[PDB]
A paper describes a structure:
Resistance nodulation and cell division (RND) efflux pumps are secondary active antiporters that are ubiquitous across all domains of life. As part of tripartite multidrug efflux systems in Gram-negative bacteria, they span the entire cell envelope and export a broad variety of structurally and chemically unrelated toxic substrates. During drug efflux, AcrB undergoes a functional rotation where each of the three protomers sequentially cycles through the conformational states loose (L), tight (T) and open (O). Substrates can enter the PD through several channels and bind to the access pocket (AP) in the L state and the deep binding pocket (DBP) in the T state.
For the V612N variant we obtained two crystal structures in different space groups, which represent not only the TTT conformation, but also the LTO conformation as seen in wildtype AcrB. Presumably, here, the closing of the DBP in the L state is also unfavourable due to the introduction of the hydrophilic asparagine within the aromatic cluster. This is likely less drastic than the effect of the V612F/W substitutions, but could still shift the equilibrium between the L and T states, hence, crystal structures were obtained in both LTO and TTT conformations. V612N also showed a similar reduced resistance for many of the tested drugs.
Residue numbers in the entry:
A (entry chain A): 1 to 1043
B (entry chain A): 674 to 817
C (entry chain A): 50 to 145
D (entry chain A): 866 to 913
The structure:
């Protein structure tokens, strides 16, 4: 193949240009996002039952839906929480790769047949089936800088006008509002209702009667009579539209004629659908939109089109409406592109330099500088062909691939320049000779590199998804390089290189380059002599190799492993936890103290703070809250003291003074759709009919045993909320029956007053919205207020609640956790300093196996992925090893020679294990992908060294030692060129601080160290390996040359 | 697919303007587009124009006075003049619908409205002309 | 049955319209609500979107709005169709 | 039409380029391809 394109350079160029043309044509069209789909696909059932407690939600909704989730494909586990705010969320998670749409749909239908078993209240509020593991693209905040709009007014504009036109903008696939559109609120007054012998019952009845829509038919309706000349819609009662119309609803005409109107017994206003969430943006009223990307969509273009559409709506906002962007992942991604493109640009610059250092002419300098961009660019087209996207893992996969891409180009050009210089051939026939030597090896090189990286893609779970990115990206670029190395680079070597005379090694040049040629000629003779003297006592250095291998093992065991590096992403969070039953106003004072700290004592670094009172990570309730901290650009946060990692500590430090709450700030994980990165997640389950009480005790029993092993378990805790006091009220069935007061009159009065009631719909400015009746606030606050509510009897007398009700206090959960249809408690935790989580798990397993009978347990989340993946890394790379051996066995046509190449693996491994433990980093996936890229380069140089030595023995008849010292001489210069340009290119990644540095540090520090030891050791070790392996496995007449 | 010719333009209410302000904006656009016959030909709405319709109002106070529940009122009006799907029957082994509706001659003109009666809680039969006032107005037969 | 266009729009059309969100490869949603008591809401997808997958997502989104329609509309049925498909023939049945 | 108008130029700017590269490979020349490619307008007019 090299010869065909040596005789057609323009054809080779047409292939290269076509390759490049498809790569850029791709790039323009590939999706671009931070991380590919890594979280397993998950579907979320969310329903609402206004006014409920957690138990009510669980047993009228949660359990009903839970008992119908069966017969569904590729399902892993089903958790649920039912909380005191009247909200259930049941989440079902599927195995990696299950068709997202197909999964949702099956769950959708299974819920459908349970829908008639839910209460009308839950059905009317709606039961959403979501695809939920998808991540937030941005969070739009909508404030009013004038101050003429509450968060409910802002919400309603956003809902009515902005929400639906942003669901329509390029690239979005789900939206969620921070509040509610308007709900017509009827704030009842109990003393007025009792004044006119009225109850909430009658108010609801009247709103249902006078705010309604009626089918009235038609004048001249079909079928008509003969000669009808008029056909017209008959318009009967329509929906109400204003607070005044609701005000004049005629409740009752007294005997004297006086009309009891709705406004006479209640206050009437537009309002929120519920008031459980307080959303503030820098302490100002705010609503907003949480936005998620569409599957397979570009993230940069979705933000650009959304912000452009928001800019298209701006002039049509009422005064003061500012759109602010407190959360947005777009900027961190543009950095990653700029940085990886930067890294790829400056990688090529360092090859132009090394090529002109050793070869000293700009003609040879141009060939690698052409072929590598060809290969990089084309790889993008290859990734379009498999469905992939321009992401962190793939981009870093390409920068990790640079080393292999360049060595194909250097080996070819150098070997031509060497063949031209050592033999005096014209550029054409010398390229022919050079390629004839390395072609077969370059092919076997490609086969072996694949056997290393391909097994990565067949890891399972979320980690397997990550490796798949690296595996496919790296393999694709490398094979494309070998193709280019057999097509274009031979053509370029034949036509561009100018003749070098035979014997000319630049030793006669003057100045910088003349000195260099002679120095390297000296050191090469030193190297070949040193190698010649090492082969005299091979027994000694096989002992050095052994010490080297056991040192690798001791390093690998004591290097702590991680998932992905935490990154300074520009935002972080803070959790607020007041005591049980703590109120809304109490949380708000705390969140304002939180926002005041960030805007004062972090004034340089914090741009904005988005506080949410009412919901948190641990659950919902008046006693939980969240604030999102939006920081200023990394450009204006210089040094470590202005990074997220540092800002998060100073917040938690200063909130240790806070006495009202428990406030805790923390940075995001690298992949937020996944979470954890640290430790285990343990669920404790009620398998018998034990109940919440016996379960919480078993939880604390486990937590006390786990706190009594601080050597192994640290920070074991429940994820859920603790029980809170609650007001139990009992209806005397006998006295109610006695007084003639029906139980329905009793309950609907209590609920619609204290919980509120969705009555019907009205039309607010052409948009249909809800109508809630609820007691005014001052009459539903304390147990004394219970007495001021009255129900009418069958005789017509008004009876107070204190007549047929007794009330006490008791404790209950504001957030019931269930796991797999059974009551559960989520227990979080991790391994102690310097311990394994797989072994901290087994202690937790043992600590749970001493809990009372009827209690079971299970691992969930990350801990479950580990239970069914731990035995992979050995087996996958036992396979990987075998294919490398068989490839070498085919390339060299020998069962024994392969060992001579394969022994170079530990030489590169230690350098990584050094630099990582030296720099204090972790065995994360960036490091491991780096390990595979470094092992591959050391093996390639070993292959080409062994190839040249064996070729010299076969087709030139030389002896073992001569061919060894001769091939290792020839391969010296290219091997140094490669390791030089590669170790320089990874330097900005190693010293990197600021944005994306954690990943760049991770990919970087491991590779650089691995390559140093790979190049410095293997130049001195692979000549040993070939000699001892050839002497152990042979027949006769080898050390002595032949014909 | 259709078309092959020309454009299709939708005019939208983005604020809470309403059908009325929208139709006016439509005719404003149509008049400007008819005043550029050099460029725009045959600009027109796809939808139907508004038609007269018979508005009938129920006096909540008088109905309350006479002891005539509003449900008795509305279900009578609708099932007579619009008809009502009541339940199913079996026609030759095949389940089919059962509609109740006024006979044609009693649901044709506004005078026919008066000939329909609703019973009060006391047991007296009350005509529709007792608790209803009616006028004429225009509305759309096809809201886009 | 028996409605005007407004009644159809605001008891049915708007209710269903406000639930058509979170659907893949959707381009635009038009509707007409007419004086004959009939609404038709049509949702059009990009070329190549899986016909079955598209219908099904719309089907489910309507399902959760169904309890907010009137019993009259529910009893008459709410059809979800693939509609851009063309007429093959039209059979006429007369009695000579 | 609003999201397709800029296609006919770009798609056939691409189409032109591949015709040139193919001819460049067939004839092993960067210049000879022009000799074939100039025949396009000769057929176009007859259609127009």
């Amino acid at each position: 193949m090299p010869n065909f394109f040596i005789d057609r350079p323009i054809f080779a160029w047409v292939i290269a240009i076509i390759i490049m043309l498809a790569g850029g044509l791709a790039i323009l069209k590939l999706p671009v996002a931070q991380y590919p789909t890594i979280a397993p696909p998950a579907v979320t059932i969310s329903a609402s039952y206004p006014g409920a407690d957690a138990k009510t939600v669980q047993d009228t909704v949660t359990q009903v839906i839970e008992q119908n989730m069966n017969g569904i494909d590729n399902l892993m586990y089903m958790s649920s929480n039912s909380d005191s705010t009247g909200t259930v969320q049941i989440t079902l998670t599927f195995e990696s790769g299950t068709d997202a749409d197909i999964a949702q749909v099956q769950v959708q239908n299974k819920l459908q047949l349970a829908m008639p078993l839910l209460p009308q209240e839950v059905q009317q509020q709606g039961v959403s089936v979501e695809k939920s593991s998808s991540s937030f693209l941005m969070v739009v905040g909508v404030i009013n800088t004038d101050g003429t709009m509450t968060q409910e007014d802002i919400s309603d504009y956003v809902a009515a006008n902005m929400k639906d036109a942003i669901s329509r903008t390029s690239g979005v696939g789900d939206v969620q509002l921070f509040g509610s559109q308007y709900a017509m609120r009827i704030w009842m007054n109990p003393n007025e209702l009792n004044k006119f012998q009225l109850t909430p019952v009658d108010v609801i009845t009247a709103i249902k009667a006078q705010n309604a829509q009626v089918a009235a038919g038609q004048l001249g309706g079909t079928p008509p009579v003969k000669g009808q000349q008029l056909n017209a819609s008959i318009i009967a009662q329509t929906r109400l539209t204003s607070t005044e119309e609701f005000g004049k609803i005629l409740l009752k005409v007294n005997q004297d004629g006086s009309r009891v109107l709705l406004r006479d017994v209640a206050k009437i206003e537009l309002g929120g659908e519920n008031y459980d969430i307080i959303a503030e943006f820098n302490g100002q009223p705010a609503s907003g939109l949480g936005i998620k990307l569409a599957t397979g969509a570009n993230a940069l273009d979705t933000a650009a089109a959304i912000r452009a559409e928001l800019a298209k709506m701006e002039p049509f906002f009422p005064s003061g409406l500012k759109i602010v962007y407190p959360y947005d992942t777009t900027p961190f991604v543009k950095i990653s592109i700029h940085e990886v493109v930067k890294t790829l640009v400056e990688a090529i610059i360092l090859v132009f330099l090394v090529m002109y250092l050793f070869l000293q002419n700009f003609r040879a300098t141009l060939i690698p500088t052409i072929a590598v961009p060809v290969v990089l660019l084309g790889t993008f087209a290859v990734l379009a062909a498999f469905g992939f996207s321009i992401n962190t893992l793939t981009m870093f996969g390409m920068v990790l691939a640079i080393g292999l891409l360049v060595d194909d180009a250097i080996v070819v050009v150098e070997n031509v320049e060497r063949v031209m210089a050592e033999e005096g051939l014209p550029p054409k026939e010398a390229t022919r000779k050079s390629m004839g030597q390395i072609q077969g090896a370059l092919v076997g090189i490609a086969m072996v590199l694949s056997a290393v990286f391909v097994p990565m893609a067949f890891f399972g779970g979320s980690t397997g998804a990550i490796y798949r990115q690296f595996s496919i990206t790296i393999v694709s670029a490398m094979a494309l390089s070998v193709l280019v190395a057999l097509i274009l680079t031979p053509a370029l070597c034949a036509t561009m290189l100018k003749p070098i005379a035979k014997g000319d090694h630049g030793e006669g040049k003057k100045g910088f380059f003349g000195w260099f040629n002679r120095m390297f000629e000296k050191s090469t003779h030193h190297y070949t002599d040193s190698v010649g003297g090492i082969l005299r006592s091979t027994g000694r250095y096989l002992v050095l190799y052994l010490i080297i291998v056991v040192g690798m093992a001791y390093l690998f065991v004591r290097l702590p492993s991680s998932f992905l590096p935490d990154e300074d992403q520009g935002v972080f969070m803070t959790m607020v936890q007041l005591p049980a039953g703590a109120t809304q106003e109490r949380t708000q004072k705390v969140l304002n103290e939180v926002t005041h700290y960030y805007l004062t004592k972090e004034k340089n670094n914090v741009e904005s703070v988005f506080a949410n009172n009412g919901f948190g990570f641990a659950g919902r309730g008046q006693n939980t809250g969240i604030a999102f901290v939006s920081l200023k650009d990394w450009a204006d946060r210089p040094g470590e003291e202005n990074k997220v990692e540092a800002i998060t500590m100073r917040a938690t430090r200063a909130f240790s003074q806070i006495k009202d709450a428990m406030v805790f700030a923390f940075n995001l994980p690298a992949i937020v759709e996944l979470g954890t990165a640290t430790g285990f997640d343990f669920e404790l389950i009620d398998q018998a009919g034990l109940g919440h009480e016996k379960l919480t005790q078993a939880r604390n029993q486990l937590l006390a045993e786990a706190a009594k092993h601080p050597d192994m378990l640290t920070s074991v805790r429940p994820n859920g909320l603790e029980d809170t006091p609650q007001f139990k009220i009992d209806i005397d069935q006998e006295k109610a029956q006695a007084l003639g007061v029906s139980i329905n009159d009793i309950n609907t009065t209590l609920g619609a007053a204290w919980g509120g009631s969705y009555v019907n719909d009205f039309i607010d400015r052409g948009r249909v919205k809800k109508v809630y009746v609820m007691s005014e606030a001052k009459y539903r606050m304390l147990p004394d207020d219970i007495g001021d509510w009255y129900v009418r009897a069958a005789d017509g007398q008004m009876v107070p609640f204190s007549a047929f009700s007794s009330s006490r206090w008791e404790y209950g959960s504001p957030r019931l956790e269930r796991y797999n249809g059974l009551p559960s408690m989520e227990i979080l935790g991790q391994a102690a300093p310097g311990k394994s989580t797989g072994e901290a798990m087994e202690l937790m397993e043992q600590l749970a196996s001493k809990l009372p009978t009827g209690v079971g347990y299970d691992w969930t989340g990350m801990s479950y992925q580990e239970r069914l993946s731990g035995n992979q890394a050995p087996s996958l790379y036992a396979i990987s090893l075998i294919v490398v051996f068989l490839c070498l066995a085919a390339l060299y046509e020998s069962w024994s020679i392969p060992f001579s190449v394969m022994l170079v693996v530990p030489l590169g491994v230690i350098g990584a294990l050094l630099a990582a433990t030296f720099r204090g980093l972790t065995n994360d996936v960036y490091f491991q992908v780096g390990l595979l890229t470094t092992i591959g380069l050391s093996a390639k140089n070993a292959i080409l060294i062994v190839e040249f030595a064996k070729d010299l023995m076969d087709k030139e008849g030389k002896g073992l030692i001569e061919a060894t010292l001769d091939a290792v001489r020839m391969r010296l210069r290219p091997i140094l060129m490669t390791s030089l340009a590669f170790i320089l290119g990874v330097m900005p990644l190693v010293i990197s601080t600021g944005a994306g540095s954690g990943a760049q540090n991770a990919v970087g520090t491991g590779v650089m160290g691995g390559m140093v030891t790979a190049t410095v050791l293997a130049i001195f070790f692979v000549p040993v390996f070939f000699v001892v392996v050839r002497r152990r496995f042979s027949r006769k007449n080898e050390d002595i040359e032949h014909s």
